[PDB]
Structure formats: structure tokens, C-alpha cells
Ligand binder design. Structure first.
Ligand SMILES: Nc1nc2c(ncn2[C@@H]2O[C@H](COP(=O)(O)OP(=O)(O)OP(=O)(O)O)[C@@H](O)[C@H]2O)c(=O)[nH]1
Ligand SMILES: Nc1nc2c(ncn2[C@@H]2O[C@H](COP(=O)(O)OP(=O)(O)OP(=O)(O)O)[C@@H](O)[C@H]2O)c(=O)[nH]1
Ligand SMILES: Nc1ncnc2c1ncn2[C@@H]1O[C@H](COP(=O)(O)OP(=O)(O)OP(=O)(O)O)[C@@H](O)[C@H]1O
Ligand SMILES: Nc1ncnc2c1ncn2[C@@H]1O[C@H](COP(=O)(O)OP(=O)(O)OP(=O)(O)O)[C@@H](O)[C@H]1O
Ligand SMILES: [Zn+2]
Ligand SMILES: [Zn+2]
Lengths: 611, 470, 191, 467
């Protein structure tokens, strides 16, 4: 997710495109990446398969999958191209674009410090938890009978416009096997797929009705786009972009499918026999998915109240494959119209982010961080109109806009195992292929309107998802009065000062180095610490990608000139002392395969076995 | 409004209101009795009857306690033989209350009730318009309405005939349902009223509602000379309502399962009918009418309507260390039966059925308003009930895998047929049951000899209590 | 007659096991059952028993079938009349019929009776156990119109009995919230 | 309103209110007694009894403490023989309170009590409408109501008969439930009242409520020549309520488990009944009504109603260093019993059952919120209860694999095998039945009355009353 996940896969790429070998900033030109067209070959597969049988040590098998997957990719292109005959177009001359590059970052040396006995590391971590979090360290006294306790008490829900069968509401637990954790953090296990959990998750009541597409709604949207184009964008690209539309093209589909992996291509291939046309695919029908992981934050709140259940609304598989070739062009056009001091995390890597903010943040500087998650976007219909107006200005072809618009109105969801039907009104968060883009556009628009001209005169601004940071801005009564037109809790704002109250961004800390004198971003150690106290399901063999992720994260923590700063940042955020010992404990855990085995224990089986 | 002695949080209030839609019921608890549900139903039944009886009409009351009829503004004639072990307590209480409030109100013919009670104490064989010491056969008072309240010790055709020749044209009966005893079962229960009954031969069981056993280790055998090798129902049956014990007989219990129409032939002929007007989870109210003369024809059938499930299966248990098998019957709420329709389409093990029933026994609340209760049925009957459903589903799959021909019953020179196993009987809600009974009666035998049953010391005590009139 | 809690059965199948009006007892199965007669045929008789609520009414088949009058019939005797029969009200089993009678003799008779269906009528073969012996006969019932309309697509292919039962249960029981109006209804009886 | 000596935040308050819906119970703690729960029930039971009896009725009192009835506006006749070590202290306390309050109170007519107490002291044989030194079968005072409160030292059929011939038509009894002693158990407990009882032969056990042991290394054995191949309950039982010890006898305890209807025969004939009116987690209140004559017929059966689970199982312990086996009994709350219905559908090891019980007792969750340390049931009884459920589940499954035929008993070699039983479990809303004797005709009258006073004692009360 964004920077890096627990398995070190992340959402960002790993190729630098914003690096230069000169001590000054240089403007360059954006180019295109050529893609190899797949080709079909059956005679090679037949002979290789027979040659696979006679001798295959290690690389002989790999040639078979590469040949087999390559055949599947060619077949998908041939079938997919025929469906969208009424929307296919050709290549028109492109509009050139330019971008700015920055010099490479400088880092301080790192020294490794670790203990020897792995059991002592567990004792230190347990001592740290008890001293700082007394209630959390005394919760576990028996096994994990959460499923049984949830069945004993009844079902409480707050639904709206839903139907279900009462005869299928039964929640007797099934077999559950896991490994007993060693760290005394009480991280819950993922929930079981039952009808009771589905109703508990859908306990949200956002029933609000306003003017759908009337005159007052249009007036608010018209003002919003005016502020965005006046305080956050330059005027050198609008007229050129309107002349050249964006349409579905063979190159878009060929490039997209080639980027998929093995298993993903096979899954898509299985749904190409009865291929519906593009105009036949419904755009307002979704399916319900439950398989998720619970989210826990440092503190003592999960030992008193049960956490919520996460859900996913999945769209049609063919809908996200026909039109997913226009995401790259939309990103390029958006980056071209933004001001040089306004940045977006799309199409960057970890190193590029460090080089941009290398010489901007210094001690004693005020930074404003604001999130917009706590806001009901379903109350006002103008939030959807504003996004469409921005999309139309960017140069989206007219019939394609109708297909996109159909997914932002009335939608329905269904649960296949139980046949449960749900209906929702205007919704912004979903599982479609424009979710981050629309959220980023709305985040910039909200900030631009509230801050007015204070956004233009700034040193560095970064926007991604629902989080943002703006340099050199404080909190005054003018923004409170402007934002209090409807209510007061639209957004949450926090004031931060470098080297005194470290700013928080995307689950990390922004710190200023001492030896070199440059800014850098590091991860959150407490978030990792609670995560090692999560039970591991039996039969899982993913205990090697996590060790490498921990090893990389530990090295970044032990850089010289950042030990003292990290201590103060954690204390000013969570009011906790003594994290250097925890970091040392993490170092010895991620040193060998056998040292990582001390975080687990004997296997415990519940609700299973007729003995 | 009518007040009942139950708490406000009980789930039985909804059932009572549904069965009595012409009243307004409120709870008011003043006593923690263990049989509150049973007593509440009887209180409401009497109120309904009094609204259907024309006033200024005298009423007979067979086997009554006169303490609870004192405040009623009607004409009651109690028939109180001195036959049971509770009679002396009832008589003393009746006298004490009469004298203690002889002048406070004096508006319910208190003086008359005292006057004729003294007359009976002088001469035993005396008839008074309020009290007597005879039986239902030896009584001589003439009336037109008879009321039976929890009577199980008389023969219905004989008792009814003696009332008819004295001018009675209407009768009422209140008591438990007699359907389980027509199926020849060994044990049963009424969960809603906390009532358990069992045969005298299985009082040493282990997993029924009325039993007691001991701990043993296992010895090779017993030198019991008397060998029966038979286990069949007998006459003796024991009842337990709350914490009270009542012995009963099967012959008298089955005699109250009357058909729709029957004839009584003797020195005079009568025609009678029988209908059910109130039914709630085990308690029924029956109305019987009589008319002189013979009309129509009889068939001899009894019909019972089921508003909820009824089960009768076969179970295995150890009686006094020996493993045997018998039959058990019970009642099931309608909501539970409805939601098991989809599960029983295939074969299911008893282990799985028990787990499903427990899950279905939990509350469902949507938007702050409840839809399913937290305890629809009691938990001590789930194991036996879950076993019954397992066998029922098995017997349905075998029936549909062996098809016969239309209009032909196969019986295969000598021709013979085969009988199949039947280990469970299930009567779903909204389903009727029909039985065969007798509809013609012509024999009415009586002892024809009455003897007094009152002792001298009891007479002196009653007179002494009534002596102090202030 | 599910909508009125009415069940009727023939006098020869009163000891069945899985019908509306029957009663049986527990047994263990026997091989040496012999009977005096060797009856091999099972036709309905003239005696039928009705049960409305908790009340029993004996009936006869010939008298019941005599009220299924045609649309036009002639009564010939000392005085001749022409008669007609119409149905004006029908609701899930109960009908109201009106007959007009006029003196004289007119027209021509055909001899057909027509019944209009608004809900749905079924009659199939079932296998049960009567007095411990397994036989087969026929039963009939009424089905609502909404259920029949929603089963059109499923019966295009072949379906097993267990699959059909599960689909019917899901269509029958439902709870709808839709703001501030909860229903918890049942379309048809579950037995 | 009625005030009880109970902490304001205890779980027993809800149980008391449910058992007495005609009163208003409020807590007021003034002393840290170790048996507070056992005294609150007795206080409420007496108040209910007085409310239903009419005034101006003479009330007897067998084995009472005169100091408790001093401030009551009722007629009492205290039968107080001197046969216990706690009796001389009670008499001195009664005299001290009587003399101290002489004059300040006028509506309780204690002036008559003071002078009348002086009369019996001078001659310890004369009768008195307020005091006496006789026994239950020796007093010759006539009344109509008799009250027994925590009495286990008399024979019920004999004591009741002697009261009936004096015109008594009502009786009451307050005490512990007799059901555990009818099952012939070796040890038991009353968790709600902090009461433990044990037999004389198991006083040196290791893992029961009332026991004590030592530390040993393990020797070859003792110089024992007697065989002693029997371990059966005897007629000697020790009770412990809080910190107070009471010895009892089994025969006298079982005599109070009276049937529903029984007859008394002799010079005069009586018929009577026994009923239960109050029951709360071990304490019961019984009412007996007696009438003269002879009516009806008897059957000799006793019925007990269970509002909460009752358990009895076989356990293995180490008495004085040697392994033995015997049976124990206890009570289980109704809420715990209902929540275990699903899990006992399978075969569970004692370890799994014990862990599940701990989670239900300490870490329960309601409405999505966790309530820490509710402690519905006391923790020291969980290990034995967990084992009982494990054996019960195993026995039920074996019964399902031995299906038999209807109404037959197999005989080939004409003896039938008897199965083994290791657990008796009574679910809530289930009744138990026992067979007892309901015909009593033989009675014995001592007629050997003799005083048990002393000269130094008599002087003490005389000095106190001669202020
Ligand atoms: N099987 C049976 N049940 C009875 C009989 N008499 C009463 N009952 C039922 O037992 C319940 C309790 O009886 P009560 O209403 O308390 O009678 P009571 O006059 O207060 O005195 P008791 O009969 O001693 O309890 C009644 O509601 C009846 O349903 C009987 O004779 N036989
Ligand atoms: N087994 C048994 N229990 C008794 C006896 N007497 C009293 N108890 C119970 O012991 C409990 C402890 O309360 P106590 O403090 O003894 O009552 P008390 O008479 O006010 O004070 P004491 O002088 O200590 O007896 C009482 O509530 C009784 O229920 C007895 O003789 N045998
Ligand atoms: N003809 C009668 N025969 C018997 N009892 C009668 C008759 N008429 C009235 N009764 C009343 O029935 C009651 C007698 O019931 P019964 O003799 O069966 O007592 P029981 O031995 O305890 O058995 P049960 O449980 O049936 O009551 C008495 O109260 C009596 O007033
Ligand atoms: N007829 C009686 N026989 C014995 N005790 C009586 C009698 N009447 C009253 N009591 C009282 O019963 C109380 C119990 O005395 P008991 O003879 O049982 O000796 P204890 O061993 O100290 O008590 P317990 O046996 O109950 O533990 C005495 O205080 C006595 O005054
Ligand atoms: Zn009379
Ligand atoms: Zn005396």
C-alpha cells in the first residue's frame, strides 16, 4: 500500500525517473515506453511439452509456463479486441509534455546493533508493553473463543433497504487452527464468513437526500471548479487538451494485458468464452466480498470494544478490463496542468520522493496536515458533479463518459452465499478502477477552495489519497469560518513543527537529518511492534517475505543522526518512552531463519475433531 | 381490565393476550409461585364463562373449593364430598373467612351462607341452596348449568347422564389436553407450564424430566426370579405441576376425549355435542350441550387441530442399570418448525441437527425492534428433539426411492405383504389428527349406597369457629 | 384448501403418515403378515370426510359432483324449463353461483363445464405408508400466482427434488426493512 | 422497606429481590461478617411469616434465642432447655438487655417479662406464658402455631405429633435443602453461602473445600493388619458456615424430607401435608398444616423442583497418602448451564471444557462490549465441574450406538449386564422424585424431666435482675 506493504510489494514502482547528475534542477521531456506485441505459437508448445517429459531439472518447467502464459495473453487480445468494435479508434498525434528532475539524495552511515539470545528479545518487548500499556498486557488468560462468545449473544444491526432470509441466520463456529503468539499484544483473528457478520458490517446509515441535478447543485459545482483552476493550475494546456479526445485504442489494450502476471491472466482467460459486448455489461451491479484483515492502531481500544468488519464491493470483471487502458493518459494530463510546487504521488518511487523534499523542511517550520476521511460525501450530490466537470475538461470522449457516469448513481449489491440484497444511493468509495484518481481530485479541490491563495504561495505541497501536507501554513479563524458553512467536522487538521512535533504522512514520520542536513521519511515502529503479536494461521508458508521486509526496515532505522530524533518523534505522538531497546530487539529477530521461529508456538485446534 | 400474577418481563404474556382478545391484561406480581403460568390461565377462563351465562341462573360446581366462590355475585351450589386429603383444610379456611367478614360488607348474601352452613353441620344428610356433602351422583339439587374445573377422577359418560336427568343443558370442562394419552406413550412434557409426567415403571430413568438414579460400577447380573421380558404402559401415571404431585389413572383420562356427537340411552334418551373454544399450548376449554330425544346419526371420530408442532419418537435409556427403549412425546413452537423446512430436505446426523437448533435459538434485533426471541424453547428438550428430526428425514428419502403403481397394492400361491419401520411421528402446524372412539353408551352402574365421611372432632371445630359471630 | 385451513381425505387412507388428515402409530416391521382377502385394486369410494378448522363433516361423492352444472341444461317433465349457471365471485376455493330459470324450451344444449383458474392447480402421484404397507395414490392442492410466475426460468432444464425444495424455501420466507416498515411475511404454508 | 446487612454492590442483592417480590430490600452494612448472606435470608423469612399469621395468636418457639423476639409485638413462648455450650451466654445477654431497657419502652410491656422471668428462676418447674426450661416433648403450654428455625436435632414425626395434641394447626421450617443427603453423597458445597460440609472419614483429603493435609516424600507403607476393604458414608457429618463449625447426624437430617401426604396414628389420629413456598439457592421454607381425623390415601413420594443445575460426580483424590475414590455434589448457575448446550453435543476433553468455562465466567461480552471479571460462579469449583461434563457427554453417545427393540428385554445365561454410571446431572426446570415412608404410628415419651441449672448461674441472673 502506497510506499510498502507488510510483504514489501507496495503501490509505488521502483524505477527512478526524477533523478539528475547535476547540482541544479533541469527540465526534461516525457517520453513513451514501447511494448512488445505478443505472438501466438503452438508448434513450440507441443515439442517443448514432449521435451519436458524426457528431462526437466529446474529450468525446463519454467519454459513451459512462459510459453503457456504467452499463448494465453495472445488469445485474450484477439477475443477482447472483437468485443469493442463500436468504440475502437486509431492513434492521433500526441501532445508533448515536460517534467522537472532533481539531484540524488545523500544518506548517513548505518551501524548494526543486535543482541544474541532470541528469548531475551521477547522478554524486553513484553516488559515494554507491560510498563507502558498495563491493560493490554493482561487481557489474554485463555484461548481464542471469540467465535463462541459472538454466537452466544444475539445479532444487533442498523440496516436500510435490505432483504434477507431469517432461516439462514446461524453462526455455529467451524474448525480453527492457529499458532499461539509470544508477544502479549492482543491482535484479533480475521472474522468468519457468516450472515451475522455481514449484517454487522452494513450498519451504516447515510440516508441523505438533496437536489440531484437541479440549479442549486450546478452552481456549487461551477464555483468549485473555478477555484481549482485559479489557485492550483496554470493556463497553458487547457485549449490543446480539449481538441484531442481520449478513446479506446488497440495499443491501450495490448499494453495493459501484457502487464498482468500469470495467475491473473489465467483467471481473466476463464471468463472469455461467453464474452458480452461493451454496451451490454452493466455498470451499476456489484458483488460483496468479505475476505480482509482487521486494522489496529496503537493504544487500548480493541480490548474494550469489538472492531468493525471490512467489506469490498467488486464490480464486473469485464468492466474493469475494457476501459482500464486510459488510466495512464489521465495521470499524464493531470501532472501537466499542475503548478511546479504542487505534487502528486502517482508515477513515483521512494527515492524520488526523498529527492524532492530534500532541501525544503528545516527545524522550526510549521506544517499543516489534514485528512478528509471523516466526511459524508453521500450527503451532497455536488461532489460527483465536480469530478465529472474536471474529467470533461481533461478531454474524455463523450460516449465513454456515459458509461462512467452510470456507476456513480443508484447501485445494488448482492451476497451470493446467502442471497442477501443491498441498495445504496450516491457512493464514492467502491471497487471500480477510478477510486484513487477521483479521491485525489476532490482532496485538491477542497484544499484549494478553503485556503484560497495561500496554496499558491508555498514551498511544497503533496496530495495522495485522503492525506495531504502543506508547508508554512497555520490554523486561523478564516478557514474555520469558510468551512463552517454547513457544519464543523468536515475535515480534521493538525499543526506540526519540525524537530518538535514531527509531521505524520502515510503511516510514517518526516525527520530532518543532523549529520547531512536533509529531510527523509521513515516508517512507524510501534505499528510494526503490535503486528508481530498477530496469530499465524496453520498451513501458511509466508514466513520469508516478512523477514526481508523487516530487515530492510531495520537498516533504515539505525542510520546515524536519526536515533535521537526518532525517540522524540515517538514520544511526542504516543507519549511512550524506551523504543531504542525495541528496535534492538527487532534487529536480532531479523538475522536468521531460526531466530524468526521464536515468535510462534505450538499449534492449537478448536471446534474440530470428533474425539 | 384483568390482572394476573406474573412478572412484566415474561414471554408468556403475548400468548395469553392472543388467546383472549376480548380482555385487557396487565401483570401484577405479589407471589413467587412456581406454577404461575398454570394459575393465570384458569383465572381468565372463569371470567370468559361468566360472560356467556344468563344471570339469575343457578350453577352446580362439581368438586369445588367454596373459598374462591365467596365473592362471586352468582348462584353457586358446591358439591363437596369428604374424600380427598385436602378437604379438611379447605373447609376450615371457608368457615374462618366467612366469620371474619360477616359485617364488613354483608352484600353477597353472607348471612345466608352462614345460616345454611350451620344447618348442614347439624344434620349431615341435608340439602341447602349453597352447600351439600354428597357426590355428583347422590346430589338432589336441580339446576341447568354444570362446571368442571380440573377434574380427572370421574367417568364422563356416567357423570354427564346423571346431570342431564336433573335439567342440565350446558356443561364446561377445563384441563390439560388428552391427545398424548391416546397415542399410548410412556413419558411426556408440557414445557410452557413446567409440567412433567411419566409412567410408574420408568421412574428410575436417567435422562427424562421426572426420574432419579444412583451411581454404580457394573456387575455381571442380578438374581431376579420374576422375569417379565415385557415393557408395556400400565394404568398408573404420575403428574408433577411445579412442585406438586398428582396420581392419575389412564382409563379416566381417556374417557374425556369425546367425539363430535354421541347418544346416551337409558330410561331417558339424550343427544349431545362437544366443541373446543379455547386452546393455548396444552390447556383447552370444552363446551357440551344436551337435548332430550334422538336425532341424526353418529360416526365415532375425534378431531384435534394443531397450532404448533407435536412429536412422538423412540429413545434409548438405562432404567436401573438396564438398557431399554420406550417412547417420549413433547410440543415444539411453530417458529422453530417453520425454519427447519429447508434443512430437512436431505439426510442429517443428530450431531449436526443439535448444532443447528442451538444457533436458531438466538435473538434477532433490527433497528432496535426485536424479530426473534432469545429463548423460544427450553434447552432441556433439545437433545431428544434433534434426534427425532434425524430419523424423520431418513424415512422420507427411502419412501421416494421405491415407487409402486397407481391403484395396485402389491402383496407378493400364498400372498403376503411386509410392514416397514416407523420410529417417529411428526404433526406439523396447521394439521389435524383423527382418532376412533365409541359413540353409543347404554350402561350406567352406581354403588347405590352413600355413607357419611365427617368425623365428630371436625364438626366441633367448625361449629366453634362459627360460634364467635363478631 | 390451504387458505382456509381445510383438509379432506378418503375413508380408506385415514391411517396414512404424511397427509393433512391422518394418524398412525409406531411399529418395528414384520414379515409374516397375512390377510383374509387378496384385494389388489384401490379406487376411491363414495365416502369422504371434511375437516374445517376443528369440525368434522361427512360427505358423499355423488351428491358433491351433482352441483357441477353446465352452462345450459333442460329440465323436462310436466312443465319444461330452460336453465343457466354462471359464476360471479371466486376467491381461492369459494365460489358464488347464480341460476336463472325460465319456462318453455329454447336453444340447444352442449354438455360442457368451464372453470377459470387464477392461482394454480396441481395434482401428482405420491408414495406413502398406510397401516405399515407402502402404496401410492394422488393428491391435489392450490398454489399462489406469484410463486408460479417466479419458477418459469428454473423449470426450463431438469431439476432434482432436493434442489427444487431449497429454491422454494428461499422464495417463501423474507424480511424487508426499507426504512420504517418491517414485514416478516410468509407467502404460503410450509407443510 | 427492609434493611439488610449486605454490601451495596454485591451480586446477591438481585437474587434476594427476585425471591421476595412483596418487599423493598435496601443494603446497609455495619459489620464485616463472614456469613452476611446466610443471615439476610433468615431475617426476611421471619418477616414474611409474621405478616401472614393473624394477631392475638399464641406462637411457640422451639430452641429459640429470647433476645431476638424482645422487640416484637407478638405473643411468644420460648422453649429454652439448657443442653448446649452457647445457652448460658444467651440467657445472660437476655437478662442484661431486659433490665437495661426497663422503663424507656412502654408499648412492649417488658415489665411483665422481667417479673415473670423472676418467677421461673425461683422455681425451675412452673409454667409461664413467655419462658420455660422444658423440651419440645415436655412443655405443657397450649397454642396453635409452632416455628422451627435452623433445627436439626429433633425427629420430625415425633416432634410434630406432640405439638398436634396441644391444638397446633400450623408449623414452619427454615433451613438448608435436604436433597444432597438423599443421594448418599460423601461431600458437597453451597457456593452462594460460603458453606462446606464433609464426612468424618475424608477430613484429611487434599482437593476439597473442607480438608487439610501435610507434606510427605513417599514411604513403603504403614503397619496395618486390618483389611478395611470398604469406604462408605457413616452417620457423622461436619458443617462449616463461614468460620463456625457445626456437627450433625445423617438420620436426623433425612427425617425432615417429608412426603406430600402422610398420616399420624396412635391415641389420636391426624392427617397433614407439606409444601414448599420459598426456595433460593439452597435455603427453603416449608409449611405444614395438620388436621384431626383420617382422610384420603397416601403414596410415599417426595418431589423436588430444580431452578438451577444440580451435579453429582465421582472424583479421585489422595486421603492420607493413599488414592481413593468417592462422590461429591454442588450447584451450578442457570445461565452457565444454558450456554453449554452446544459444546456438549460432541466429545470434549477436560482441558477443553475447563478453558471454555473460564472464558464464559471472566471474559463475557454483551452488546459488543467486554465485562471483565463478572465472576458469576466461584472459581474453586470449576475444575470438578469441568470433569463432570466430560463424562456426561461420553455416556450419551454410547447410548446411541446400542439401539434396542421396542418393549422387550433380551434374555438368552439369563442374567442381564448392568452398565456403569459416573455422573448424575439435573438440568434446570426438571423435577426429582424419591421414595420415603408415609406411615408413622410408633412414638416414645421420655417422661424423665430434670432441670439442668446450676447454683452459681442462677445467682448471676438474680443479681442482674435485682438492680
Ligand atoms: N393433574 C392434576 N392437576 C391439578 C389438579 N388440581 C389442580 N391442578 C393444577 O395445579 C395447579 C395449581 O393448583 P392451585 O391453583 O395452586 O390449587 P390451590 O387451591 O391453590 O391448592 P393446591 O392444589 O394444594 O395447590 C392448578 O392450576 C391446576 O392446573 C388435579 O386434581 N390433577
Ligand atoms: N448446620 C447448622 N447450621 C446452623 C445452626 N444454627 C444456625 N445455623 C446457621 O449458621 C448461620 C450463621 O449465623 P449465626 O451467626 O450462627 O446466627 P446467630 O444465632 O445470630 O449467632 P451465633 O450466636 O453465632 O449462633 C446461621 O445463619 C444459621 O443458618 C445449627 O445448629 N446447625
Ligand atoms: N364423585 C366424586 N368422586 C371423587 N371425587 C369427587 C367427586 N365429586 C367431587 N369430588 C372432589 O374430587 C376430589 C377428590 O380427588 P381425589 O380423590 O382423586 O384425590 P387424590 O387421591 O389426590 O387424586 P387426584 O390427583 O386425582 O386428585 C375432592 O376434592 C372431591 O370434592
Ligand atoms: N428437645 C431438644 N433437644 C435438643 N435440643 C433442643 C431441644 N429443644 C431445643 N433445643 C435447642 O437446640 C439447640 C442445639 O443443641 P444440640 O443438642 O444440638 O447441641 P450442639 O451439638 O451444640 O448443636 P448441633 O448438634 O446442631 O451442632 C440447643 O440450643 C437447644 O436449646
Ligand atoms: Zn348438593
Ligand atoms: Zn414451656
Amino acid at each position: 500500500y502506497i510506499f510498502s506493504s507488510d510483504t514489501g510489494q507496495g503501490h509505488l514502482q521502483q524505477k527512478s525517473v526524477r533523478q539528475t547528475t547535476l547540482p541544479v534542477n533541469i527540465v526534461e521531456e516525457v517520453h513513451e515506453e514501447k511494448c512488445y506485441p505478443p505472438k501466438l505459437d503452438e508448434i513450440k508448445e507441443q515439442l517443448l511439452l514432449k521435451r519436458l517429459q524426457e528431462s526437466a531439472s529446474t529450468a525446463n518447467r519454467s519454459r513451459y509456463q512462459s510459453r503457456k502464459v504467452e499463448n494465453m495473453k495472445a488469445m485474450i487480445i484477439h477475443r477482447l479486441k472483437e468485443g469493442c468494435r463500436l468504440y475502437l479508434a486509431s492513434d492521433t498525434p500526441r501532445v508533448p509534455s515536460y517534467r522537472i528532475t532533481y539531484p540524488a539524495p545523500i544518506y548517513s552511515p548505518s551501524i548494526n546493533i543486535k543482541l544474541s539470545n532470541p528469548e531475551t528479545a521477547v522478554a524486553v518487548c513484553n516488559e515494554f508493553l507491560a510498563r507502558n500499556y498495563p491493560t493490554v498486557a493482561s487481557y489474554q488468560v485463555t484461548d481464542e473463543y471469540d467465535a463462541y462468545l459472538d454466537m452466544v449473544d444475539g445479532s444487533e444491526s442498523c440496516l436500510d433497504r435490505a432483504t434477507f432470509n431469517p432461516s439462514k441466520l446461524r453462526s455455529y463456529p467451524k474448525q480453527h487452527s492457529y499458532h499461539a503468539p509470544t508477544i502479549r499484544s492482543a491482535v484479533p483473528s480475521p472474522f468468519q464468513n457468516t450472515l451475522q457478520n455481514v449484517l454487522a458490517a452494513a450498519t451504516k446509515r447515510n440516508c441523505n437526500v438533496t437536489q440531484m441535478r437541479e440549479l442549486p447543485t450546478m452552481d456549487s459545482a461551477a464555483f468549485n471548479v473555478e477555484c481549482f483552476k485559479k489557485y492550483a493550475c496554470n493556463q497553458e494546456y487547457w485549449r490543446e487538451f480539449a481538441s484531442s479526445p481520449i478513446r479506446v485504442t488497440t495499443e491501450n489494450l495490448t499494453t495493459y494485458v501484457t502487464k498482468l502476471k500469470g495467475p491473473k491472466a489465467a483467471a481473466l482467460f476463464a471468463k472469455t468464452h461467453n464474452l458480452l459486448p461493451l454496451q451490454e455489461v452493466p455498470m451499476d451491479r456489484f458483488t460483496m466480498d468479505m475476505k480482509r484483515d482487521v486494522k489496529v492502531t496503537p493504544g487500548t481500544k480493541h480490548t474494550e470494544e469489538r472492531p468493525k468488519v471490512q467489506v469490498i464491493q467488486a464490480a464486473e470483471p469485464l468492466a474493469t478490463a475494457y476501459l482500464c487502458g486510459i488510466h495512464r493518459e489521465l495521470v499524464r494530463r493531470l501532472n501537466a496542468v499542475l503548478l511546479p510546487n504542487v505534487h502528486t504521488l502517482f508515477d513515483m518511487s521512494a527515492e524520488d520522493f526523498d529527492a524532492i523534499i530534500a532541501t525544503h523542511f528545516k527545524p522550526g517550520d510549521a506544517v499543516l496536515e489534514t485528512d478528509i476521511a471523516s466526511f459524508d460525501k453521500s450527503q451532497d450530490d455536488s461532489l460527483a458533479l465536480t469530478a465529472m466537470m474536471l474529467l470533461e475538461d481533461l478531454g474524455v470522449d463523450q460516449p465513454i463518459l456515459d458509461l462512467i457516469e452510470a456507476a456513480f448513481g443508484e447501485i445494488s449489491s448482492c451476497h451470493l452465499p446467502t442471497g442477501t440484497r443491498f441498495k445504496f444511493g450516491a457512493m464514492m468509495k467502491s471497487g471500480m478502477f477510478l477510486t484513487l484518481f477521483v479521491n485525489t481530485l476532490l482532496n485538491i479541490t477542497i484544499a484549494s477552495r478553503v485556503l484560497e491563495e495561500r496554496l499558491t504561495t508555498s514551498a511544497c505541497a503533496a496530495f495522495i489519497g485522503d492525506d495531504n501536507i502543506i508547508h508554512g501554513v497555520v490554523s486561523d479563524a478564516l478557514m474555520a469560518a469558510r468551512c463552517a458553512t454547513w457544519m464543523n467536522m468536515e475535515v480534521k487538521i493538525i499543526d506540526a513543527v519540525v524537530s518538535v512535533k514531527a509531521p505524520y504522512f502515510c503511516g510514517g514520520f518526516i525527520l530532518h537529518d543532523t549529520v547531512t542536513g536533509t529531510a527523509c521519511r521513515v516508517a512507524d515502529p510501534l505499528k510494526r511492534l503490535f503486528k508481530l503479536g498477530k496469530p499465524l494461521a496453520a498451513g501458511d508458508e509466508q514466513d520469508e517475505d516478512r523477514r526481508r521486509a523487516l530487515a530492510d526496515e531495520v537498516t533504515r532505522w539505525q542510520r546515524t543522526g536519526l536515533v535521537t530524533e526518532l525517540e522524540r518523534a515517538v514520544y511526542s505522538r504516543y507519549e511512550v518512552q524506551g523504543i531504542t531497546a525495541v528496535i534492538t530487539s527487532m534487529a536480532t529477530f531479523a538475522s536468521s531463519k531460526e531466530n524468526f521461529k521464536k515468535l510462534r508456538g505450538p499449534v492449537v485446534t478448536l471446534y474440530g475433531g470428533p474425539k | 381490565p384483568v390482572y394476573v400474577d406474573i412478572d412484566a418481563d415474561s414471554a408468556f404474556l403475548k400468548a395469553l393476550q392472543r388467546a383472549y382478545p376480548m380482555f385487557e391484561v396487565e401483570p401484577r406480581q405479589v407471589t413467587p409461585n412456581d406454577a404461575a403460568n398454570a394459575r393465570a390461565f384458569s383465572h381468565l377462563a372463569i371470567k370468559l364463562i361468566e360472560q356467556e351465562i344468563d344471570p339469575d341462573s343457578t350453577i352446580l360446581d362439581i368438586g369445588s373449593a367454596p373459598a374462591r366462590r365467596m365473592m362471586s355475585d352468582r348462584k353457586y351450589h358446591c358439591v363437596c364430598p369428604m374424600r380427598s386429603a385436602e378437604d379438611p383444610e379447605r373447609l376450615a379456611n371457608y368457615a374462618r373467612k366467612l366469620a371474619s367478614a360477616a359485617g364488613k360488607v354483608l352484600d353477597r348474601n353472607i348471612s345466608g351462607k352462614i345460616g345454611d352452613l350451620q344447618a348442614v353441620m347439624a344434620v349431615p344428610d341435608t340439602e341447602t341452596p349453597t352447600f351439600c356433602l354428597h357426590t355428583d351422583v347422590s346430589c338432589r339439587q336441580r339446576a341447568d348449568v354444570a362446571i368442571y374445573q380440573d377434574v380427572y377422577a370421574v367417568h364422563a359418560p356416567t357423570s354427564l347422564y346423571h346431570q342431564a336427568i336433573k335439567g342440565v343443558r350446558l356443561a364446561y370442562w377445563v384441563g390439560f389436553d388428552t391427545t398424548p394419552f391416546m397415542y399410548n406413550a410412556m413419558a411426556g412434557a408440557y414445557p410452557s407450564y413446567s409440567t412433567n409426567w411419566a409412567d410408574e415403571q420408568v421412574l428410575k430413568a436417567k435422562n427424562i424430566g421426572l426420574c432419579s438414579t444412583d451411581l454404580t460400577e457394573g456387575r455381571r447380573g442380578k438374581l431376579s426370579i420374576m422375569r417379565g421380558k415385557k415393557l408395556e404402559p400400565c394404568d398408573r401415571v404420575l403428574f408433577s405441576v411445579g412442585s406438586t404431585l398428582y396420581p392419575e389413572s389412564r382409563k379416566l383420562l381417556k374417557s374425556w376425549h369425546l367425539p363430535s356427537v354421541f347418544h346416551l340411552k337409558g330410561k331417558l334418551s339424550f343427544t349431545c355435542r362437544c366443541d373446543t373454544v379455547v386452546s393455548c399450548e396444552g390447556y383447552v376449554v370444552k363446551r357440551i350441550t344436551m337435548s332430550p330425544g334422538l336425532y341424526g346419526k353418529t360416526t365415532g371420530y375425534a378431531v384435534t387441530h394443531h397450532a404448533d408442532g407435536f412429536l412422538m419418537c423412540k429413545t434409548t435409556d438405562t432404567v436401573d442399570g438396564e438398557r431399554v427403549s420406550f417412547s417420549v412425546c413433547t410440543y415444539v413452537p411453530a417458529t422453530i418448525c417453520d425454519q427447519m423446512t429447508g434443512i430437512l430436505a436431505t439426510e442429517v446426523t443428530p450431531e449436526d441437527a443439535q448444532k443447528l437448533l442451538v444457533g436458531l435459538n438466538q435473538r434477532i434485533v433490527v433497528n432496535g425492534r426485536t424479530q426473534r426471541n432469545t429463548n423460544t424453547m427450553k434447552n432441556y428438550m433439545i437433545p431428544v428433539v434433534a434426534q427425532a428430526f434425524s430419523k424423520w428425514a431418513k424415512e422420507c428419502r427411502k419412501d421416494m426411492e421405491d415407487e409402486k403403481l397407481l391403484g395396485v397394492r402389491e402383496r407378493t400361491c400364498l400372498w403376503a405383504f411386509k410392514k416397514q419401520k416407523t420410529h417417529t411421528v411428526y404433526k406439523r402446524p396447521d394439521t389435524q389428527s383423527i382418532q376412533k372412539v365409541q359413540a353409543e353408551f347404554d350402561s350406567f352402574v352406581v354403588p347405590s349406597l352413600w355413607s357419611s365421611g365427617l368425623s365428630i372432632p371436625l364438626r366441633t371445630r367448625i361449629k366453634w369457629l362459627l360460634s364467635k359471630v363478631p
